[PDB]
Write a protein that binds this ligand. Structure first.
Ligand SMILES: *[C@@H]1O[C@H](CO)[C@@H](O[C@@H]2O[C@H](CO)[C@@H](O[C@@H]3O[C@H](CO[C@H]4O[C@H](CO)[C@@H](O)[C@H](O)[C@@H]4O)[C@@H](O)[C@H](O)[C@@H]3O)[C@H](O)[C@H]2NC(C)=O)[C@H](O)[C@H]1NC(C)=O
Ligand SMILES: *[C@@H]1O[C@H](CO[C@@H]2O[C@@H](C)[C@@H](O)[C@@H](O)[C@@H]2O)[C@@H](O[C@@H]2O[C@H](CO)[C@@H](O[C@@H]3O[C@H](CO)[C@@H](O)[C@H](O)[C@@H]3O)[C@H](O)[C@H]2NC(C)=O)[C@H](O)[C@H]1NC(C)=O
Ligand SMILES: *[C@@H]1O[C@H](CO)[C@@H](O[C@@H]2O[C@H](CO)[C@@H](O)[C@H](O)[C@H]2NC(C)=O)[C@H](O)[C@H]1NC(C)=O
Ligand SMILES: *[C@@H]1O[C@H](CO)[C@@H](O[C@@H]2O[C@H](CO)[C@@H](O)[C@H](O)[C@H]2NC(C)=O)[C@H](O)[C@H]1NC(C)=O
Ligand SMILES: *[C@@H]1O[C@H](CO)[C@@H](O[C@@H]2O[C@H](CO)[C@@H](O)[C@H](O)[C@H]2NC(C)=O)[C@H](O)[C@H]1NC(C)=O
Ligand SMILES: *[C@@H]1O[C@H](CO)[C@@H](O[C@@H]2O[C@H](CO)[C@@H](O)[C@H](O)[C@H]2NC(C)=O)[C@H](O)[C@H]1NC(C)=O
Ligand SMILES: *[C@@H]1O[C@H](CO)[C@@H](O[C@@H]2O[C@H](CO)[C@@H](O)[C@H](O)[C@H]2NC(C)=O)[C@H](O)[C@H]1NC(C)=O
Ligand SMILES: *[C@@H]1O[C@H](CO)[C@@H](O)[C@H](O)[C@H]1NC(C)=O
Lengths: 276, 277
């Protein structure tokens, strides 16, 4: 695989033509009004969410990625293809590492690495893994997870699904209460998937719901000189051994075809094999 | 026929108020909680908590809404189907002060239940069941319109009875902060009070792991009413005079009712189980 820097910078210019990535990355204090009604990107337009004093107080003053430039970025998905890959060292060598859905690293360091600079957080994760922060034990566990992220950006898409509404109110309340006690940088994208989906429409990727991986590649494109993908592999067998794989390392086929095409054209390095 | 025994009632009142500080228990107040304080739920495992936000606290009253209030005749109106066809409306509205349970509707049922409302209770689960969690403009407007019709009534919201109220409390709180100043409704939010209430009534032979909103209502009423009349308390699905079937609720626990019937017997209160004059 050889990196084609000119093709990549060209892809970047095309992306930024269709998506104002720095702006789209997160709402800012002055980009919303108290009382404003947000709609949900992937839900009926009739669903709304009112912006409280408190939600707004949790937004950044300027985009967390304004004037940031990193040389090598790793974007790490959650496929089982990472299990036994020993990609840990190669991933941690990167200048900036994106991860998906609050994925765990402590017990998987050798394969996925421990360095984290941005991680995505669907608010449904409170419900599934932290019991809606209903007990002291859960509130402490959540606090502790967030402390381990140090100064990483936590990218919370609250306005994708209307089913994230009630949990958004629990998160917001938790973050206000613990204001000043965490170095984690919150980022809250608004209604951005129409604009993101337009760029990728012209590259014949269609689907109902664009994946977090393609979305990550899109952000990464604005701030990384060179993107390497790890853990993107939708199928439940290994591509070299053909032995079975766990669906996720810690236990869509249209998207992956596209990334493999891009790997072919030297835009990015998709890694599907053991590292060391 | 029923005769009011005023001396027996005033005796019951003095006994209640000796064991329950009703005026205090009625609602938390701004200065009675701290931002960050963890509330527990009276009828749930002690492990469940709710943190008091800036916003929750801003919605509490500065003093108890029933401090130094005294009414002559109080009606306490439950929701049993026994009210259907009863024409109790006029007798209920004649009262000086009317308590109602669980945001019960009156517009379509005036002749039987009355229209006058001075306090109504509100389990926050009602947002999920009838207002779709305030998720749409239509639901937010419907809720706003219901609250506007209560004018200056107290809305008594027991947020800390069941842990399953937690998420919907956060939706209410947010709704009320957003609409601050636009409603004359007087919010009241009782804290952890059922230990103290249930202990007075333990010695009167009523046990349960959940006390009923009606007994709770009688307890509050006792602190501010000279004479209490109960309407719509009747747990069974048949009429006591005709024996024909009844809807469970007029708008569609047996231990508690036994107790209220005993009290009716002793002239403390008038339980009404029949058509009104
Ligand atoms: C609802 O009304 C209640 C009165 O019916 C309020 O209860 C009072 O609340 C205060 C503040 O929490 C308590 O003050 C404490 O007093 C005890 C004294 O020991 C007592 O132990 C039990 C009480 O259950 C009993 O044996 C005697 O009352 C004893 O005197 C101290 O340990 C504390 O430091 C503190 O000063 C009152 O004791 C308490 N009264 C009763 C009868 O329990 C209650 O706070 C109200 N709740 C709300 C939300 O308004
Ligand atoms: C940004 O990163 C690029 C590319 O870095 C390369 O690939 C990464 C994924 C990692 O594996 C890196 O370890 C690896 O360097 C950097 O460009 C590279 O710079 C180095 C010099 O530091 C170049 O190597 C030299 O080449 C000359 C002539 O061929 C030799 O005489 C030298 O001894 C030495 O080997 C290399 O050509 C160049 N690589 C590419 C693909 O262009 C870049 O330095 C870095 N920038 C910053 C500011 O960090
Ligand atoms: C995401 O960026 C898009 C694209 O730049 C923004 O869409 C523009 O919004 C402006 C308002 O400032 C419109 O007048 C432009 O016509 C839009 N341009 C395009 C190409 O659609 C959008 O505001 C951004 N969304 C967020 C949440 O930041
Ligand atoms: C990207 O994230 C990692 C956190 O995982 C940052 O690396 C840490 O930097 C601190 C502060 O100097 C060190 O004390 C830690 O030992 C580093 N941890 C690891 C795991 O390497 C890194 O600095 C961040 N980089 C950028 C550009 O934000
Ligand atoms: C009203 O109720 C009171 C209290 O229950 C009655 O007064 C008691 O009457 C009994 C006789 O059955 C006496 O032995 C008690 O000493 C009285 N109690 C007190 C505290 O004085 C009263 O009789 C009732 N009135 C009516 C009309 O039934
Ligand atoms: C409290 O209300 C009662 C009930 O209406 C009042 O006493 C009654 O007064 C009416 C008419 O004024 C009479 O027809 C009843 O026969 C009375 N009943 C009894 C048992 O005395 C009482 O005066 C009211 N007190 C107030 C307004 O202070
Ligand atoms: C109890 O509630 C009713 C409202 O349900 C109050 O009665 C209203 O009072 C206003 C202003 O005094 C009148 O203009 C309305 O016509 C009355 N409505 C009804 C239905 O009677 C009553 O004042 C309240 N009682 C209190 C606070 O003691
Ligand atoms: C990528 O670089 C090659 C040289 O490797 C160049 O000729 C080509 O035009 C670039 N872009 C595309 C789209 O192939």
């Amino acid at each position: 695989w050889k990196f084609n820097r000119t093709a990549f910078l060209h892809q970047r210019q095309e992306i930024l033509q269709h998506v104002d990535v720095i702006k789209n990355f997160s709402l800012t204090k002055n980009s919303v009004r108290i009382g404003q009604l947000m709609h949900y990107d992937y839900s009926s337009h009739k669903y709304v969410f009112s912006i409280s004093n408190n939600f707004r107080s949790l937004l950044p003053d300027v985009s967390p990625i304004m004037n940031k430039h990193y040389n090598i970025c790793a974007v790490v998905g959650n496929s089982g293809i990472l299990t036994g890959s020993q990609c840990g060292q190669e991933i941690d060598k990167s200048d900036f590492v994106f991860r998906c859905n609050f994925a765990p690293t402590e017990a998987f360091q050798r394969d996925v690495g421990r360095k984290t600079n941005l991680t995505t957080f669907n608010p449904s994760i409170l419900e599934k893994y932290y019991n809606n922060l209903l007990t002291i034990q859960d509130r402490n566990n959540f606090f502790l997870s967030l402390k381990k992220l140090d100064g990483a950006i936590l990218w919370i898409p609250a306005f994708f699904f209307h089913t994230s509404a009630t949990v958004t109110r629990t998160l917001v309340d938790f973050f206000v209460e613990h204001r000043g006690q965490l170095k984690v940088q919150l980022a809250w994208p608004g209604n951005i998937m129409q604009h993101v989906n337009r760029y990728w429409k012209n590259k014949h990727l269609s689907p109902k719901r664009l994946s977090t991986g393609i979305l990550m590649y899109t952000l990464a494109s604005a701030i990384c000189e060179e993107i390497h993908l790890y853990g993107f592999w939708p199928f439940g067998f290994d591509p070299n051994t053909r032995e079975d794989l766990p669906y996720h390392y810690y236990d869509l086929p249209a998207e992956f075809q596209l990334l493999y095409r891009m790997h072919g054209e030297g835009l990015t390095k998709l890694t599907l094999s053991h590292c060391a």
